[model samples]
Target: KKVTIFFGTQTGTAEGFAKALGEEAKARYEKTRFKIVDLDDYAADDDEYEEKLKKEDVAFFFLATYGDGEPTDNAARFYKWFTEGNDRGEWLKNLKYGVFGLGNRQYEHFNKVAKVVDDILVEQGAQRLVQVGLGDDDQCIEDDFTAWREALWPELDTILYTVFDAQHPYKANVAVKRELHTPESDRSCIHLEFDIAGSGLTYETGDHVGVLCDNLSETVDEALRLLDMSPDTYFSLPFPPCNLRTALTRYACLLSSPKKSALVALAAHASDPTEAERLKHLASPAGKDEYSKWVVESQRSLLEVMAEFPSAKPPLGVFFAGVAPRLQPRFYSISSSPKIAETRIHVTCALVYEKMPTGRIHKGVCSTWMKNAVPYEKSENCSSAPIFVRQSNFKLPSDSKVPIIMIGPGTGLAPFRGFLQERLALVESGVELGPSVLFFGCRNRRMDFIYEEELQRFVESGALAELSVAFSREGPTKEYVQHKMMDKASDIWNMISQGAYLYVCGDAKGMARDVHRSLHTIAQEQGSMDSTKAEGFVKNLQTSGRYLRDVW
Candidate 1:
């Protein structure tokens, strides 16, 4: 027996879920084998997909709607084909499928991609084994997955028993935490290391790490005070007993955007008639724009909403049930190779914050926690962070003979740092090194040159062929990694012609796009091809898995 588990992800949760599901299926069906598919690895014309679909194997999709209800980049091609392709009627008549969607309910179109795919499968005459599964990140994602998984085995007439994913996780001690940027810089960029000494966890160089962070102490205190609840008031996840303060800090999300639905629900309990009327009005269809301006744009949290309208104090139970979403984990790219340090994992984080229109500053949950709460020294005994590893296809080539071309600016340098470290280790082992090139850019070399010493050491030892560094602030014009790519276009084209693997990591909206265009330019100029032909050439690299991006 065989089954295919296809996944599309942004924060790596979907991939983790897919793999876990596959393991359960395999254990239940002794003879069952699996085909795990990354949605990005196939295209519309990919014959492998057609062949697989035509087979009798069952297919399950774990597709997460990444930021604002859009499909992840990897899933876009498959999504378009299933939703928009014509003449797919009866195409999947012989196929039976299941879908599990991952999303945040705080967003308007929660799990939009998964819902559409499920709908279109039915429209095309593909039958489902059961109803679609929806996992909300605003709740416990691990628990959300558990409910669906238990139901899945039963619906498919398979008898199996399993426990919660061990990935609902383990506490890891802080090994190191340090800011990488100078005080003069506008932003604080930090590097963190976690010691997994007794966690029994192992990871590859390109894998990601999940960090479970608690809400800020101030936010937690304010929410309890707003609802007139005592800090010692006990409640439950209905598990081990805990007080309101502890629960809010460790379990609930205080910075979550107040929902219109919750506001309308709480209006029934408002003591002031005027405040009640306003709440009802904002929740109505006609007041959406006004609500967006006053609530959404202001970045008002559930706690902030309660403070703004003091008369709208709903009971603690109702507030928890309707307004407060649960705190969830955040993921970061692993910046170290496990081969180098078996018991440690590292991440590069930019201490991000938003200047709200309300004149309030909102700090990034995990980044801020790492920078402020976690100790700088090795203090594994004093602090712990819930941790888990996630698999990724962002890896080095199997053949070290294949050259590498990397373009990563800012914190996007995380994975490439791991790549270089792994290669450096190989070079130390007497493996013949290839001509690998890395194009790194930042605002200033003096202030924000992360891991500069390590990179230089690799270059001197001949583990790295070239280090093209760009200091945007030091130049008349803002220079970037893509500009450096263009400067070395001739060398880049020759390597690609000789089958070099091109890798890019960083801001998806800006730097990744620029690097892509730069590659296309190199193809057109040095490869002696027209624009359309060059586009196809670049696309071919994607099809062949030579052009990989770890952009977010």
Candidate 2:
């Protein structure tokens, strides 16, 4: 195999780029075979990835930076595994890799995954074909991709293709499966089960499941009503036989971050003199705050917005026919271990249910859809969704003797569940089990703490050791998992001294930052070093891979 193109995508965009690149490479190279794969195709743990890193041809990472500056779940896993633990050279030095990060500049962390990968790969001894490519979402994605492709084609020209292609995702039996994790915790979540349709959606154990979702119902409805669409009007559906509603419900993401152009188009007519003035403000390029305050914060869907000025009128169809599809479905790292149960994959989804001032309930389309999956018609919800397996290299350390500490709060605990389950299965099979410590936290022990039963079961079975919980609301004022580390400072020191592996997962900016700081504090307090030395210690740990983070 000469060239391996791997993608870590949240939406379909990065994967699309990978496919386009593969096609272009084939056209240019001709006789060479082209292999394209998702990052989730790689395992996330240390053991599986050791073999993968050593086995690859030239590799290209097509990934996205989501949620501030963090890697998409699948991408981040590989990042962690790649960056983890000591100057263990040899393997990565044998390979060459390139990265193209897809991102939005509206957020501060533009193209962050590409930057992180470039840094880690260089540190790990993987040579680059060129500087990493960043496809800015704020600008045109196609332009970014084409410009980078021109630079990369020459290097790819020389590489032989590895025939690593697996089954096609769409060809798989993609029946959306829905279920309720808990009656109390559940909302309108539609559990999506990829039928794998015999298409063998083969993926690494630590990969993500990318389910394509349509824009929210509210967004779609708002667009339709604002445009005064004819309910019975029919055109050749882009998805073939499906009706417009069906396509809008499952295929198109309608509620992407609204651009000002769409706003102006939606509000072109304002009947009331004052209403016209406000509409102008909504589209004012110079008055961003006025736009935000007058339009964005109002949370008016296109219809509601149009309704504000009864006189405002526009051809609704033309207005909406042009905008980008709704926002993409969120990706979650699969929390089930196929090694334990080959056919079953589990997702620990937290329902996103919030209340608005009009007492209207705002929903996280995917989460709520999944949360309410049990009662809804499978076909009407995500059952009608598209799902694909994304591969990744984030995994448990291969050696059982490795002591591991896991930190996760809120929904970030999803992957750790799989990690523990994987290790537990190994232990059951007489595979040597390492000492495992988990630092778990949540808002309230009584109301939220997901996976409580499983945690207890793992503890009872001795699959988990040193289980610590930082119940924030359980105490006065507020306390977090990081603060809990201060309570057991000596234990943390002892673990680090004994070569324990530490991994933290949670809110990126706040929680992830705090966890790192907590480690710094623990190191300083226990090692009796000043802040400077403590910082050095954490940095060294990061370089060595002992201190790993799945944060963000």
Candidate 3:
């Protein structure tokens, strides 16, 4: 109660940040009443939260923005509960706090939620020890964190009481309790089921819960093998309850943009000039993008890279010791509402199991796990491979009168399931619901279509007023969801013009981008608005908090 840090996040990145700080603080600082509080616990109830805040002496809040400039599910309730209304200093006048934000620069509103939270805290008169820091995941995050710590926390420590905990990565709070929907796969996708019991997992209608899963064991071993590490030799890890392999698999994100040190340590046996130079070049700034390009284009596992230079190959034991671990869990949009089902939250997994050109069998760790788990109603997974729900405020109005348009395609339909379920719950509760249209698309209608009958039932029963589906693979010409939206431009425009909120969820680089184009086009052609005005229509929708998304 004296000093607590709240970590608000979607994926595990922000939480990992908090854990790092908290654990270090506990070991480094003495007699400090410090605590690491997840946003989930800190944002529970209004009165309780207020009471807890009033008792706290200081807070270091780490906020991570997820999906289209929105707070992840874990932090959404806190964002709304504290930011609304004119009473800025209602309960936090005596408290002091510091903030760190984690985000990606690729996003237009990079660090938007983090900045919003920090700004709101200052407005509430919580003393800012210094400027808030934003760490861009589009680049290396450790550097950003290091800069923040050197700049902020030391100064803050002098003014507040602190207590901290040694974090265990596989700790129970993020338990894989009971999987309601075990994962199963059709020809193209793996379905997942999760059980909800005993564990503290709970949710509401119209909220996104992210599942956390670990990298497979074989993947970790392969990375170790690539680095020439000894399979039998033991290694010491500073983190609690996790070995080197477990940390790499379950906690540390080993995938994406490998560090220069990783390559440097393994560079002793390069095949030739190009490989040797490539290893050395990885340390330079110019090489950052180039290295990233290689990672993407080649999709080389760490082991795969090590396999190339066999003549200069280090021993297996040494090789395994050098390579870093594999990556962390990838969160998906929750497509079901707890209000309707009370237990299960649906997810759409676009499986990745394609064969590489070189005959390497590449696969997604979590998606495959989810696919395999669907057979059983109950879910069980190793600590290195479990899932959890990360909540968000992305929900429809509790009132059924809010008409809305949904534009989501492929796996984007995940959250729409929650929206529909929420709609059904409201109607079931005797409220009259407004008209809604879902613009969804995928490759085909027959083999790959997911949740087919469910959408039909919603439309047939009038719960979902209309559902426009684009079957791109089945048609003579390949058309997508946005094209389907254009065909129904009049109705789509009418829905928005009549004050219905529009929501888009799906692929960040593809479907989300295209859907945005379609929205602007609809505003231009259907509303007859100029390009500027059409842009304003979309901008205003976002500014007014009406246009919501959960895109990755």
Candidate 4:
């Protein structure tokens, strides 16, 4: 009689897909009713979920695999309960379901959450509607989903309705924009404050703020030059007619590498036989290695490809409609505490400029935009960006007296700044606070050590108990946060024994993994536990939510 579409999303992609699926289902099957739900909300209300699970005719899951294949913060509770194999004993025998997974091919455990959910449902005696669809972010997830859904409607006719609530961003005014790095430093980092007064947007200490940015003028102009079109030329690529400059600057992702399908599309418009053949080969399965080398490995953008094959002049409509993906908002950890200034949200952003294999510098869109943003004085013409708050499970303990161990390096110190601010506010209110330890790292003290004065102020206020810094490039032997952690292994172990909440934020590829291993070593040597026992202890810490990570 009814269908339920549940989404486990970290960055809102899965939620968006779930809502779109529900809307399509409603249009296709008028007789059936559809309900769109967040897995977090669903798992919270146990009685309602039990009843709905039994009564629903079909269940559709749009689950996104978060960092390192872990469930999204919102879906953690549900994942735990579902995987635990409670005493229900094949309770979902009457239910039918379908799963569509969202993941990146770069990650080792691609589509893990969806695969586990699909298998678990089958193990619990639920009927499988069709084979699971795994959307790859590396190639094109939207196209993958479209293909999956096209096959799904026919299968649903043999078997299956809804509306969508859209997410809208607020235009937050830039109150302050200042450089965090020193003039003598080789790199750049900025501290920004967004005034959200009267916007009714509120954020906690550990929440994230998404900033929508426009493409760089140089890149936009280059795209226009490649297309040989006037900036004022109008098109209806996405509903309403918009000029090429507006579309290129605001809508299209100019930096993204062209996918195989996009290359094929370009091949159709190639005037030279050799260029057309090359484009087709890059699109072919046989040219996987060449494609990987030239396109993916070199980080070649669509504009670059167009420049390389000057004769391959694709129509603006085809290029905009088929090739370019929509620009996405970049999320940063909130660095200001609402307790200190309710109307202002602070962000610490490090400008990213990576030299690609192709010798071109790839710049971070939002960070560069932030660096160029003009701070507001007494004028109404100050720069403002579209922004929104995202709730996160990375939070300080409820009890003010509980100890906390924060391990973050470089720009990762963003959220910890807020944590200290909140603690400072609490101390001002005459509340007793517990021990707070921060392990921060950077290249050199004068180079990239951001928030230096502020951190010292927190230490002076007694809000922070200890400040451990590792300057990787300062000494003869390079030192990192994990090494610092190991140096104070006994102290760290003591804090853990006293039930301290541990938190880690930063790069997942190396730093986070290294820190994780160091923690395991601490458990083994300092806690007098064996390798396997230490592993179990760490796993238990994660399961109990004592250990939290915000690595990307």
In order of appearance, the predictions have TM-scores of: 0.70, 0.63, 0.65, 0.76
Candidate closest to the true structure, highest TM-score: 4
127-148 per-residue lDDT for model 2 (tens digits): 7886788777656777878888
Q: Return the candidate ranking by lDDT, descending.
A: 4, 1, 3, 2
Give the alpha carbon lDDT tens digit for every residue of 1-552 in model 1.
457889997435687688788887778776767778777654323344566566745788999996556688668656644553234457778777889998778898799999988887777778787688888866766787888888777656551121111236767777878888877777888888888776677789887787888888777777778878788987643325688887788767777666666787679789999999998888764665678778877777777777877898776677666667556677788998977877889889988798877777788888988887565364444567888876666789888888998888889899888898888888889888778999998888768888888889989887688999888896687888877888898999999988899988888778877788898999999999999999899967875678877777
Q: For residue 51, what is the lDDT in candidate 2?
A: 77
By TM-score, the better pick of 1 and 2 is: 1
Give RMSD to native, each candidate: 10.2, 8.7, 8.3, 7.0
Where does candidate 4 have its weakest 10-residue lDDT segment?
160-169
lDDT of 4 by residue, 1-552 (tens): 678999887435687789799998889998888899878667433444567677767899998897667788667656755653233668898888889999889998899999988987887789888778899877878888998898788778788511111136788788999999888888898999999887788789998888878899999989999889899998754435688898889888888788676787789999999999999898774676788788877888888888999988888788876567567678888998999979999998989988888888888889988888888864567889888876666789999999999999988898999999999999999999998899999998878889999899999999899999999887697989988999899999999999999999887668988999899999999989899999899977875778888766
- The per-residue C-alpha lDDT of model 2 at residue 311 equals 68
lDDT (Cα atoms) of all candidates against the true structure: 0.78, 0.66, 0.67, 0.84
Tens-digit lDDT track of model 3 for 21-40: 88777765666777888776
Error of 1 at 12 (Å): 21
What's each prediction's clash count? 0, 46, 44, 0
